[PDB]
């Protein structure tokens, strides 16, 4: 479970990102995450795969955030995210919800603007860290 210092770090980043998004036009033709995105809609065995996909998308997007200011504030958050991802992958192990959800996240970077993707993962960040991580850790 994330520490106060870690969460303070994510908050500082999330807020910096929010502020930069007020200067951009970040509309989406279609939202990045499904409206009912929730790992409980998935089989227990499928959840870690879904979580991995949103983690990878988050890293991909945030690692591309432009400008020194954002790189600075994202430095430690990116580090904690890398560590969470790697730990998830050392625990890991016909087309339906998982498949469709995976498809949506993989296709999003190809179809939507940078602002839009940036907006999506920033606003998804605390749900990911707080809800999605916990449910996976519980169900194992």
């Amino acid at each position: 479970s994330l520490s106060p210092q870690e969460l303070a770090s994510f908050k500082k980043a999330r807020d910096a990102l929010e502020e930069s998004l007020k200067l951009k036009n970040w509309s989406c033709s279609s939202p990045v995450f499904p409206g009912n995105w929730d790992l409980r809609l998935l089989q227990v065995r499928e959840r870690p795969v879904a979580l991995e996909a949103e983690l990878a998308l988050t890293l991909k997007v945030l690692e591309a955030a432009a400008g020194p200011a954002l790189e600075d504030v994202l430095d430690q958050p990116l580090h904690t995210l890398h560590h969470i991802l790697s730990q998830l992958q050392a625990c890991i192990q016909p087309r339906g919800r998982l498949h469709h959800w995976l498809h949506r996240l993989q296709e999003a970077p190809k179809k939507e603007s940078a602002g839009c993707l940036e907006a999506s993962v920033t606003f998804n960040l605390f749900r990911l860290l707080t809800r999605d991580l916990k449910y996976v850790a519980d169900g194992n």
Binding site: S1, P4, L7, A8, K11, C28, P31, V32, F33, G35, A119, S120, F123, F126, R127, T130, R131, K134, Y135
Partner: protein, 197 residues
């Protein structure tokens, strides 16, 4: 005469929940109603109306477990004064960020008594939509006469607090919630439970 907006519009948390409160518009008649709205999720954002506080005459509105509400992100509320043939401008609250601003309620202590073991267990009635918060509690115990109280170590919601007794009148139990996200938040102590022994 256009209806004049609500004053001191404030979005606050109490007992794990969120409330919008406000005061009447300066020049208004009593016998007005208010309509309330909130922002939905940041990526699918618009102002949505709170069905329960549609044309309410009260000065507050529960803002918890609303439809399309995303509590993992900041959201504002808004209020406007409404009478037939009229409506004031909207007045928005400040953003509230639930994970960082929620205020915990005291636990409800479930008490059992083995011969020499007094057991206190914290229970909570939580809003069904609440994020999975990490909650702990702290029991205070004292002899109703003798002043000194004992504070038992912080205990995770889910574990009982065991108290070993001494044969020795009235004895008392209280508990408070600690919620730590980035900065520790403490509830008030629960109403004491006192019993004979």
């Amino acid at each position: 005469p256009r209806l004049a907006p609500p004053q001191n519009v404030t979005l606050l948390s109490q007992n794990f929940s969120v409330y919008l409160t406000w005061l009447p518009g300066l020049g208004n008649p009593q016998d007005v109603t208010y309509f309330v709205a909130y922002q939905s999720s940041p990526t699918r954002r618009r102002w949505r109306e709170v069905e329960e506080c549609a044309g309410t005459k009260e000065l507050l509105c529960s803002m918890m477990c609303l439809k399309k509400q995303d509590l993992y992100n900041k959201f504002k509320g808004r209020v406007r004064t409404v009478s037939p043939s009229s409506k004031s401008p909207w007045v928005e609250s400040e953003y509230l960020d639930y994970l960082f601003e929620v205020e915990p309620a005291p636990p409800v202590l479930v008490l059992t008594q083995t011969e020499e073991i007094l057991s206190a267990n914290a229970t909570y009635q939580l809003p069904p939509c609440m994020p999975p918060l990490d909650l702990k509690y702290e029991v205070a115990f004292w002899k109703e006469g003798a002043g000194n109280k004992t504070l038992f170590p912080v205990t995770p919601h889910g574990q009982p607090v065991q108290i070993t007794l001494q044969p020795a009148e009235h004895h008392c139990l209280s508990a408070r919630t600690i919620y730590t996200f980035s900065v520790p938040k403490y509830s008030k102590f629960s109403k004491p439970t006192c019993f004979l022994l």
